[PDB]
Amino acid sequence: DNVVREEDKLWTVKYAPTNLQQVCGNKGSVMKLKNWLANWENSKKNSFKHAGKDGSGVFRAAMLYGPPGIGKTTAAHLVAQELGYDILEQNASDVRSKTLLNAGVKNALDNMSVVGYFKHNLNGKHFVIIMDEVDGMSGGDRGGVGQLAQFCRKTSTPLILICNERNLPKMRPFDRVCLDIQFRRPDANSIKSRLMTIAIREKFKLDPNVIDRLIQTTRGDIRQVINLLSTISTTTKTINHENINEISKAWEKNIALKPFDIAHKMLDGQIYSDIGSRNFTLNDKIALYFDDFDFTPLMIQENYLSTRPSVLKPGQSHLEAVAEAANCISLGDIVEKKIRSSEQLWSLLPLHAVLSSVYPASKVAGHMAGRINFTAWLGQNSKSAKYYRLLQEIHYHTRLGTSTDKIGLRLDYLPTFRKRLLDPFLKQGADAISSVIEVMDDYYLTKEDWDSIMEFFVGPDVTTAIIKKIPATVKSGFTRKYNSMTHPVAIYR
């Protein structure tokens, strides 16, 4: 047998934490996870219905999430080993599709460990299923993400899931099934001792005053910090202020910004000045747009009226600059329609970047007056789609009787239908029920069509308060009468 010399190993392996206390930072999260896994057995004894002081007794699965290289996997393995559980580990290198998930780990959710039996702690025979890199699985249904979410609800043994981005759409199925544990970027103070110990052991000089800079270079990535030290020390045995700037610039972690950060940066007036534009060039602004080309234009259109500008030309009011920005945004919308047409003119993406984001921002750049808001266009679009679907259903129910298109139905017929369907209840009480039903029968309208019709009106003709004000007895009688009769069908499927 041949062993590996410690001199042959990577510094990250050579100095990997061995117990939970050596983990730098995120002490609260580590304690929370340890207590959860320690009292998991008691939580099971109570059928996972009684919540303790921490409220973790109602979760059969824990979900650890945070940025890269902060100690998620290390902490998970350390807690699993400390409590004496047998670890069953899965990662992105393994196939975790729905079929493999059901044919693989599914059978281990309520199964004993042969290893835990032949190595004999009372939990030694029980598993701790660690699913690492959950964000590294692709697919909506065949991927098995929803399958893992389902597993998290009925697992008979502890289950720990690890990911990097908890807010991705693919993570939606894990909304409120697991105890969420957040690992944050550790600050320089929580690690300074570790790097100084590594420096003295590795026989190279490191100035403490630059540690804060080094972390800033790695964005709190301890693994990247160790890699940087290992690579730099190969030729430069002393790290001080005389060489910190070059090392930081060469090793800077360039991560794509998120929509809120993109909006904040693009709307800052400083970058649009002569010196600012010379430091942050137009190419940099286009790249910033390209960090997320789908969401950046929506962010800009959402937040371009919520600034105090500092780039106003002489004699120009804020309103005039807003108008110019709005015109440019309209042109950008036209370009976007061109891009997503049958010609697939994706080569126009850079132009879009200028018209939708850079130009209006340069017109209204300044300081954000209030909080930055997420785009409201997506929700409004979904609501409009829902209302149009309901309108189409109503129209094709009433098609046999009316003479109009759906738009004409909304604009013209609906007020009169309101008068002949809703007003009678507010005047004659229950005595009008029959009449209303009669009208419905004349137009093949159902109860759901009635509610949907009542949901369309805007302005002074809003019906929610009026409907809620109706006596409950009248509505109950209306439902009873409608359910006590036979009704026609406009469309026979």
Binding site: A108, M112, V115, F118, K119, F127
Partner: protein, 257 residues
Amino acid sequence: ASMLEAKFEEASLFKRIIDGFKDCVQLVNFQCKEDGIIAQAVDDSRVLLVSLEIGVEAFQEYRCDHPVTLGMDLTSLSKILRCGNNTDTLTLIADNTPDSIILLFEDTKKDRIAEYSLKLMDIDADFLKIEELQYDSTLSLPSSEFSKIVRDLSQLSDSINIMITKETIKFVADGDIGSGSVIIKPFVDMEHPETSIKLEMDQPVDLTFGAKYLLDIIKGSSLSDRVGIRLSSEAPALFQFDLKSGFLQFFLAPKFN
């Protein structure tokens, strides 16, 4: 090419042995000593343990200078072995500090020699000690019948329950589409002892196991006509197939009560 030299007079035996458990464990460490070959492998789910013993009598000219350990992936080994022939003699050659092992297929009737090299794997799996245990139930039954029952019951549920009582063996599988049951009792025939189902029940037993694990286990039925199942109250079930001078054993952890 002299440290380890193990000759099977028939290449079919080793290929069948590998196929017996190639669908459950991928990486396997074979420990070769003067007494023969022993292997122990844990499945990915860590609930099924495969143990293999091959005695010297099974070989023809077994020779081992000093104990050696060979880590092999079973897919590559099966691919290599499928290039041989049953009549051909198969010789395994290994040297000191080997990075690979040589598989030599020789034909006596002809003068055709097929030499293959297989790169060894660096496996750092721990070796577990299995101590002899006295089980409360021991049943020997035909391998074909056991495989048939297992396959029939796996069509209904993901788990199968085995219940052993006085001269009675019951296999149940209850799922969503439906349920199925199979009942057998001990029987012996002098004319056909090979079909004699034998049961020794010190105490009644009741256990449940995963269907996929049993399906993997029954793949060894091609090696032995009979199969021996040992069950304890709360211990892993042992499924054993006997060889000429060795054995293939599957220790399956049951599902928690």
